[PDB]
Each structure stands twice: as C-alpha cells, then as structure tokens.
C-alpha cells in the first residue's frame, strides 16, 4: 500500500483540529506560557521545579505539588522539602528535593535565561549546569515559560516516531546530537502544518489523551 498514508493522515487530522474549538483551547494555553515574559524570577523558578518533578510523574500531579508547595521551592530546607515531596506522592522525593535545592544558586533563572542570545543556547546552559535537568526537561521548561522552537522529546513521542518509521530505533538515551536530530524532524512536521514546536507538542498530546495540560 501507501507507506506514507499514516503520515498524510496525521497531517490531515492536525489540520482538522486547527479548524475546531480545540485550536482556541491550545492557543490559550500557549498564551499562558507567553505571559511568563511578565512574571518574576520567583515564578520562573517554580516552573523549573515543576519540570524537575515531571520525570516519573504526572503533569496534573506536578501542578498540584506546585500549588501545594509554591514559595517552598525557594524557602524550605532540604529536609522539609524532601518530606513534603514524599507525602505528596512523588516516588523520587529524595533526589528531586536535592536537585531543587541545588538549583537555588540560579534562583534568578529568568534573568539568566533571558541574558542568552536565544533559547537554544539557554538550553545548553540549563542542561550543563543544573543537575536533574536533561535536554527534555530543559526544553519542557523553556516551552512552559514562552519559547516556541524547542521540542519536548518524551518516551511517548519516541515510541510513536519509531513505530511510524521516522526513526530506526527507540534511543533510550538521548545525546545532545541525537536530541537535536529528532527535534528537527518534529520541526519539519510542525512547518508542514504551520505550527511552532511549542504548539505542535500540545496538538500531539491532545491526539493522544484528549487533554491540554502543560
């Protein structure tokens, strides 16, 4: 048959979503990310912590841990933070509590991130200096605070890409080189549907779950 039928239908489905009320819902979420340009360093640091907590967890869970703790990401001592995370349901409370505390030396994360030439270079800094932050987490963070040209390459999109033959094998470990390589394929798909990577990510998640989170 036509080996490109599934790719062609994915493009068609996304164009269908863009012509539905789903577009307004996703656009609103995108606008909320963009609003971070006006939020404080403290607000940005909380989002960085949300992303540090995402791995092996739920966005919905992260959102509630955020609302629960809030200012505590900056004021709570190691021991007290580790305690709240354990009681809030996070299985890696110990490691995450440590990463968060260590990240505090960069608490003015908004000023640091905006000082860079662009988001790509800023991502490099996030990955290299902040423990608990890999390329996926850094991209997730940048997207959530308003940047549009970084892909969030999670284990689900990797499986979809592999299964539909966009990549030869599920990577497991993503080196900088491999991350940027896979990000470019997603970037091409995005342009094929006239969507930025920040937006494409939400359309893809919506197709997978019917929900629009962050």
UniProtKB/Swiss-Prot annotation:
**Keyword annotations from UniProtKB, A to Z:** DNA damage, DNA repair, Glycosidase, Hydrolase, Lyase, Multifunctional enzyme
Any one GO BP annotation for this protein = base-excision repair
The site feature described as Important for guanine/8-oxoguanine distinction is recorded at 214
Q: Which reaction does it catalyse?
A: 2'-deoxyribonucleotide-(2'-deoxyribose 5'-phosphate)-2'-deoxyribonucleotide-DNA = a 3'-end 2'-deoxyribonucleotide-(2,3-dehydro-2,3-deoxyribose 5'-phosphate)-DNA + a 5'-end 5'-phospho-2'-deoxyribonucleoside-DNA + H(+)
Asked whether the UniProt record includes DNA damage among its keywords, one would answer yes
Tell me what happens on changing residue 136 to S: Loss of activity
Pfam families for this protein: Ogg-HhH (PF22175)
Q: Where is the active site?
A: 136, 154
* pH relationship of activity: Optimum pH is 8.5.
Q: Which GO terms describe its molecular function?
A: class I DNA-(apurinic or apyrimidinic site) endonuclease activity; hydrolase activity, hydrolyzing N-glycosyl compounds
Q: What does this protein do?
A: Catalyzes the excision of an oxidatively damaged form of guanine (7,8-dihydro-8-oxoguanine = 8-oxoG) from DNA. Also cleaves the DNA backbone at apurinic/apyrimidinic sites (AP sites). Has little specificity for the base opposite oxoG.
Recorded domain comment: Contains two domains separated by the central HhH motif. The C-terminal domain undergoes a conformational change upon DNA binding.
Entry similarity comment: Belongs to the type-2 OGG1 family.
Q: What is this protein called?
A: 8-oxoguanine DNA glycosylase/AP lyase
Origin species: Methanocaldococcus jannaschii (strain ATCC 43067 / DSM 2661 / JAL-1 / JCM 10045 / NBRC 100440)
């Amino acid at each position: 048959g036509n080996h490109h039928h599934h790719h062609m239908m994915l493009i068609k489905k996304i164009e269908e979503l863009k012509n539905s009320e789903i577009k307004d819902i996703i656009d609103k979420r995108i606008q909320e990310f963009k609003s971070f340009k006006n939020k404080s360093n403290e607000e940005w640091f909380k989002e960085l912590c949300f992303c540090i907590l995402t791995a092996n967890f739920t966005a919905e869970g992260g959102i509630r841990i955020q609302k629960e703790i809030g200012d505590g990401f900056l004021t709570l001592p190691r021991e007290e933070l580790e305690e709240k995370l354990k009681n809030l349901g996070h299985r890696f409370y110990r490691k995450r509590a440590e990463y968060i505390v260590l990240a505090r030396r960069f608490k003015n994360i908004k000023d640091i991130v905006e000082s860079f030439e662009n988001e790509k270079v800023a991502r490099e800094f996030l990955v290299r200096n902040i423990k608990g932050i890999g390329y996926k987490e850094a991209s997730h963070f940048l997207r959530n605070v308003g940047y549009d040209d970084v892909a969030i390459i999670d284990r689900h999109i990797l499986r979809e890409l592999y299964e539909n033959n966009y990549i030869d094998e599920i990577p497991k470990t993503l080196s900088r080189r491999k991350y940027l390589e896979i990000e470019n394929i997603l970037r091409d798909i995005g342009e094929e549907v006239n969507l930025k990577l920040s937006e494409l990510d939400l359309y893809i998640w919506y197709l997978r779950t019917g929900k629009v989170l962050k």
